[PDB]
RNA sequence: UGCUUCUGCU
RNA sequence: AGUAGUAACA
């Protein structure tokens, strides 16, 4: 049965109140909102529930582990991106009492055309809002909330209660009192909250390393680094190696490279990219992780004849042995991860007591650490059974997990026939695993909510938080200064509790009007940036080779998303590249076809998409200069090109084909 | 693998 | 204004 501070933090919720319920990491948020839930809807004929979750996961986690209590007398539904395509989901949710979800899967079903596939807000009676801190800016959450405040101040009726879930609000990167409290009355405004209902142990160590005495492997990459800086004959060149920086500035170089045609700079620009990853690989995992990064880099390339190709390869073999040589020796081993064998052999003896997440910032980075793991002697015979878990990021670096995939390993580590996880963020909140008793966070950079919510993984009565990061480092700063942030927090919330009535009230309408009214103003500007040029006068120019290839009368959007070419001659500049791609995921209306390509330069332009009964080329907008009367630009999203772009007509496209055959 | 939210960084 | 990652959607 619920504990006390559950029935008290629910309260105003049972009386219809819109609220945040405030309770820490593991407190039972899950069953105190299954409770209102279950009031809400023997309350009253004809309620319906939307649970709002923002990890594939959880619509399982909640549903097997919480909701599915409700089944006794009510029709609950769960739909994630994996089910998507099964249902129109107006259909499944108007016969539905409850329907867990996604939050995108909601915001997609309130912008739908199709009669079928859409929702109202006013279709539900309460939205229960998981981890709701991230109802701020433009997350899903909060683009939905907007739409909420712009119905509520227009005078709309009949609107959903709303139940927000958070242990951690946060401060939103303020630190002072005032501006905390600003935050949290942001927060306050953005769930339209009348009340934050609140109530009425584990150790926490750093674990610090050195920076390696002696590290020939990054100093040898330094050196090829600074070799093709001197090939460039350019001067002002960045010197600072191993940088994030220096990472975003050889981008930088690399974009404007492109914008300009310089093919030897941007060509140099794009390997020394790959050397500075190779070199933050090296700092991360071990040496051997960050030549594989170079080694297949080069390995992937074949015989060309741009010399600029050439002095970059010839470069390369002439270091290759030698470090590779270096890799394989244990003398200048990374020092993060002796401390983490460290770490694990304390906690990990005798076999299987422990229960572990090491969470890293990267997909890569999880599964190098897996692999080192494997590899190191010293662990091996501790019974360590580890896995990777990741969501479903891509990228060339490193494909993601499948829900599915996710599933079959959390389901391991519930018991215990895992007993160690290396996790990227895909399960810093949310994730309950009773039996974990030990969370490392891996050298990571983040907020004062994810640390909170990463440390809260761990919810075995006598668990251990370790801080596995450089001594000296900003990543120690930050961790303190998060400390004191969740102090801050706490304090903030306290005062907005404790303020009176009226006060509240007066600034959550002013909070509110400046939300709705910036949105406009927003709108409107990004409106007259995307009309400032006529479709007909904008080509597009390969990013690698700079032909021109097509125009932007020539794109067409498919779900708002997806940018095909719809010109019959489009096809005279790319060329088919692959065998036909292989999604996990099933869409209702599309499937991938092959990959294509520049067909003078083979640069990676897209993929086919097969539509129905036609197949158009997916244009992704990285691969390409973007040449307007005013400017040439290397875009990496579509959202700020500045001309307008129709949406896609299957019966238009169908009809105009046929008159050409 | 198309997309662009969030978080870190400048 | 970018950049890197990540996750979600498709
Ligand atoms: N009243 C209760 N009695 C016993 N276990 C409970 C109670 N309420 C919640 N739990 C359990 O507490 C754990 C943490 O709950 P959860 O909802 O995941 O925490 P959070 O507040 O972070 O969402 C779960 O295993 C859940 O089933
Ligand atoms: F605060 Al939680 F799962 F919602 F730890
Ligand atoms: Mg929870
Ligand atoms: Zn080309």
Known sequence: SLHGYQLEAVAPALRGRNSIVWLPTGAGKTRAAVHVCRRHLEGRRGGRVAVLVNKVHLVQQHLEKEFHVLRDAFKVTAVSGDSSHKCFFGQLAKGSDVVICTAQILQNALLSGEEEARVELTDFSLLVIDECHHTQKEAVYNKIMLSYLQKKLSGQRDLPQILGLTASPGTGGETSFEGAVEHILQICANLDTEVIASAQQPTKQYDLCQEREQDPFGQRLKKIMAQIQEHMEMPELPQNFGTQVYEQRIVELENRAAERFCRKTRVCALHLRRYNDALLINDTVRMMDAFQCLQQFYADKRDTKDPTERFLATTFEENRATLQALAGDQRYENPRLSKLEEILQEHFQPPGSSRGIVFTKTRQSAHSLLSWLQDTAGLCGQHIRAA???????????????????????????????????????????????????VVRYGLMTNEIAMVQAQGRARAQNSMYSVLAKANSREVYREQLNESLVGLMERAIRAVQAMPERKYRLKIVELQRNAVLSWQVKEARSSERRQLHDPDDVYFHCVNCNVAVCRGSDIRTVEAMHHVNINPNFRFYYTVSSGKIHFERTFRDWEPGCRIVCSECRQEWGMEMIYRNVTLPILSIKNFVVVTPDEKKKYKKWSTVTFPIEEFSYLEYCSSTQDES
């Not at 060339?396 to 996880?421: C, H, P, S, W």
């Open 388 to 438: 990777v878990l990741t969501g479903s990021g891509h990228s060339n670096q490193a494909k993601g997990m499948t829900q599915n995939e996710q599933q079959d390993v959390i389901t391991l580590f519930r018991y215990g026939e895992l007993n160690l996880l290396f996790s990227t963020s895909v399960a810093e909140e949310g994730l309950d695993i009773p039996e974990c008793n030990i």
